[PDB]
Paper text:
Here, we report that some flavonoids act as the inhibitors of the Ae. aegypti Noppera-bo (AeNobo) protein, which belongs to the glutathione S-transferase (GST) epsilon subfamily. Nobo plays a specialized role in the biosynthesis of the principal insect steroid hormones, ecdysteroids. As ecdysteroids are particularly important for the life cycle of insects, it is expected that a chemical inhibitor of ecdysteroidogenic enzymes, including Nobo, would be an insect growth regulator (IGR) that impacts insect development without affecting organisms other than insects. AeNobo adopts a canonical GST fold, which has a well-conserved GSH-binding site (G-site) and a hydrophobic substrate-binding pocket (H-site) adjacent to the G-site.
Next, crystal structures of AeNobo-GSH complexed with daidzein (AeNobo-GSH-daidzein) and luteolin (AeNobo-GSH-luteolin) were determined at 1.95 Å and 1.50 Å resolution, respectively. Daidzein and luteolin inhibited AeNobo enzymatic activity with an IC50 value of 3.87 μM and 3.99 μM, respectively; these compounds are known to exhibit larvicidal activity toward Ae. aegypti. Although daidzein and luteolin both bind to the AeNobo H-site, the binding orientations of daidzein and luteolin in the H-site are opposite to each other. The A-ring of daidzein is nested deep inside the H-site, but the A-ring of luteolin is located at the entrance of the H-site. The Oε of Glu-113 forms a hydrogen bond with the hydroxyl group at C7 of daidzein and two hydroxyl groups at C3′ and C4′ of luteolin. In the case of luteolin derivatives, apigenin, which lacks a hydroxyl group at C3′, exhibited a substantial decrease in its inhibitory activity having an IC50 value >25 μM. Moreover, chrysin, which lacks two hydroxyl groups at C3′ and C4′, did not exhibit any inhibitory activity. In contrast, 7,3′4′-trihydroxyflavone and 5,3′4′-trihydroxyflavone, both of which are luteolin derivatives but lack hydroxyl groups at C5 and C7, respectively, retained inhibitory activity against AeNobo to a level comparable to that of luteolin. These data suggest that the hydroxyl groups at C3′ and C4′ of luteolin are critical for the inhibition. As the hydroxyl residue at C7 of luteolin is close to Phe-39, the A-ring of luteolin cannot form a CH-π interaction with Phe-39.
Residue numbers in the entry:
A (entry chain A), B (entry chain A): 1 to 126, 128 to 218
Write the structure that this text describes.
């Protein structure tokens, strides 16, 4: 009878990875949302900093549990809401396959794209090929993964596809996928855009960020 | 009867997080090691790149499972070797608490310290206060965590303490902990250095890196 509370701003790819997960698990009505707007600096308020000293979104509070990383939020939601469904992580090797690709997103893809995007928002940068090489190297890895399995972690859609597509749909606005160069990734990307919950859970926030990018450029 | 194989170089903090975990779980005799030496560029050999397109250590192979992130390796080893022991992740909230701090290491602490250390090794940088501010901000977060619990994830030692101490003992060589400024973290650090397996699993590799740092400086 205790509902997790997701502190969020959907311009954020980490947040949209969680929103995609919530919709895919069918648990929109079980997870309360609390908006923490980055542009208005609500993530720097004293209450939120006390909740998360990293002053970042997303955060999940569930009773006394406070999770402060989208990838930990996603695996936890899988454990308590998805054990007996298509997204289950009950099997140890399947859990590790999915966790391995969550780590790829958190430590590789998201790190490299947020350097580029944050720099454009804050105006540190104004786009040499040097900036996009790390992103393109991450695309190369993703292309290998999607050559060996149909989705990022295995032949079925898993929660690991959601943080990655949230990032891909963001950095794609400055480093677009070439179908000739990354054909498996381009086809996987088109497939994820056809998921019924993609528009509400990811595209809305992507559109907001695109507007901020066109204002800064 | 199938032994996981850890591809490793102990100069790496991610690798040493795993070596600490292996020793703490008491499974040194169950995990085979295969040396992949970074300085000699063994991580760029065709076989290793095929195994891991990120061309990085550590990698764990267990039958057909290939894990390519230390934090995924650590949780998997917990699942298959530590279910009924002091490091167990069977409980969903405990798993999420531990995973949350693994994410902090992978996405915050390790990211910020590897920028500084890689730059010193490759000679991109030669140490303004600008470089160490992100590390000190990560120390500030760690200090909050260790104010609220005795170890990084809860009041017991968990596998999340190991990747973090591996990083702390590395970046500490250029950004040392002040006991007056981060007292809980300094005391936690001294406590981890007293673990019986710390010298072999972490200090050996730290010493090797210290020598490379003094050669480049
Ligand atoms: O750290 C911030 C990060 C971002 C952000 C937004 C979209 C991305 O795809 C991304 O990788 C980062 O947007 C902000 C917007 C703000 O007003 C203040 C901030 O600190 C941030
Ligand atoms: O990427 C590399 C990273 C490192 C490394 C070593 C110690 C650290 O605490 C760290 O954060 C990174 O050492 C290398 C050493 C090499 O010879 C080649 C490399 O690519 C690397
Ligand atoms: N690894 C974290 C990253 C979270 C993160 O960096 N969020 C950004 C937005 S994309 C944020 O809230 N930044 C605000 C700040 O850094 O002050 C996760 O996946 O949750
Ligand atoms: N998030 C990864 C990071 C692994 C990583 O970056 N390893 C470095 C050494 S610390 C490496 O092997 N770098 C070689 C390269 O990038 O070519 C993990 O935790 O396993
Ligand atoms: Ca409601
Ligand atoms: Ca307003
Ligand atoms: Ca309040
Ligand atoms: Ca208050
Ligand atoms: Ca042996
Ligand atoms: Ca040699
Ligand atoms: Ca071979
Ligand atoms: Ca070969």
């Amino acid at each position: 009878m205790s509902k997790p509370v997701l502190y969020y701003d959907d311009i954020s790819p980490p947040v949209r990875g969680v929103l995609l997960t919530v919709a895919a698990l069918g648990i929109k009505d079980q997870v309360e949302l609390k908006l923490v707007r980055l542009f208005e600096r609500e993530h720097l308020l004293e209450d939120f900093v006390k909740l998360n000293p990293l002053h970042a979104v997303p955060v999940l509070k569930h009773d006394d549990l406070v999770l402060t990383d989208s990838h930990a939020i996603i695996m936890y939601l899988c454990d308590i809401f998805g054990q007996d469904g298509d997204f289950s992580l009950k099997d140890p090797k399947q859990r590790a396959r999915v966790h391995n690709r969550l780590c790829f997103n958190n430590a590789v893809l998201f790190q490299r794209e947020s350097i580029v995007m944050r720099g454009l928002i804050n105006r540190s940068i104004v786009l040499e090929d040097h900036h996009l090489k790390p992103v393109q190297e991450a695309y190369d890895c993703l292309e290998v993964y999607l050559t060996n399995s149909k989705f990022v972690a295995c032949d079925q859609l898993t929660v690991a596809d959601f943080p990655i597509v949230a990032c891909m749909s963001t950095v794609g606005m400055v480093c677009p996928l070439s179908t000739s160069r990354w054909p498996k990734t381009a086809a996987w990307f088109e497939t994820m855009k056809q998921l019924p919950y993609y528009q509400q859970a990811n595209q809305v926030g992507v559109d907001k960020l695109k507007e901020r990018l066109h204002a800064v450029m």
